[PDB]
Amino acid sequence: VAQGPNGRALAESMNPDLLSAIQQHISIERYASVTYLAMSIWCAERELAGFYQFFDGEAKAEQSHAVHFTQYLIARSQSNDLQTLDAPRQNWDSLASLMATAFQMEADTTSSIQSVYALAERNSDTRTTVFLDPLIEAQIQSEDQFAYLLGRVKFANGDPTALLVIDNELRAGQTQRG
């Protein structure tokens, strides 16, 4: 039995380019987390309490995704390398602009997973594609959700009254098309 790079028994070696890609993706998840924390704060500063609660929960979710990836590297007997984390964006001129950045962040998180996925397929790493499959499925739902929130905010067309109604929807947990 061979020992993997993190010292555990090694079921199958991993290509170092794929390992690097996964470690980089963990940073993307962590960056999504702190971005949604920053967005939660921006909403709280403007008394948009429902948006604040929504993004507070999304920040915790993205962090859980990052940890989920660290556990996969442990399971593959690969080293983790937790990286320096950039400061998030923190300023937006409107809720519509913030929601566009949020949608972009969600789509970019998926693109990162897709990049890892393609590298795994190039290396015939079926453990990794199987690991990522349900995460891509979750991303489809999150992209649908963030498209819904962005589209509903854009529909409001900057009217504070409509934004208050949507804010109350989010406080109630009405965050998807259903």
**Binding site residues for Fe(3+), as ranges?**
29, 62, 65, 106, 133
101-120 binders of its own copies (CB under 8 A):
103-104, 106-107, 110-111, 114, 117-118
> Count of alpha carbons within 13 Å of 17, Cβ hemisphere only?
10
Smallest separation, CB 28 to its own copies (Å): 14
Name the region of 84 (left: φ>0; alpha: ψ -120 to 50; beta: rest). beta
Q: Which of 90, 94, 122, 173 binds its own copies (CB under 8 A)?
A: 90
Residue 109 binds which of Fe ion, Cl ion, its own copies, none (CB < 5-8 A, kind-dependent): Fe ion
Helix ranges restricted to H, the chain:
16-45, 49-75, 95-122, 126-156, 160-171
Q: Residue 13 interacts with its own copies (CB under 8 A)?
A: no
Q: Which of 22, 25, 26, 65 binds Fe ion (CB under 5 A)?
A: 65
> Tokens 């320096």 sit at which residue?
84
53 versus 109: smaller Cβ distance to Fe ion: 109
State the Cα–Cα distance between residues 24 and 20, nearest whole angstrom. 6
Q: Residue 27 interacts with Fe ion (CB under 5 A)?
A: no
Smallest separation, CB 148 to its own copies (Å): 5
Contact 37, 55 (CB under 8 A): yes
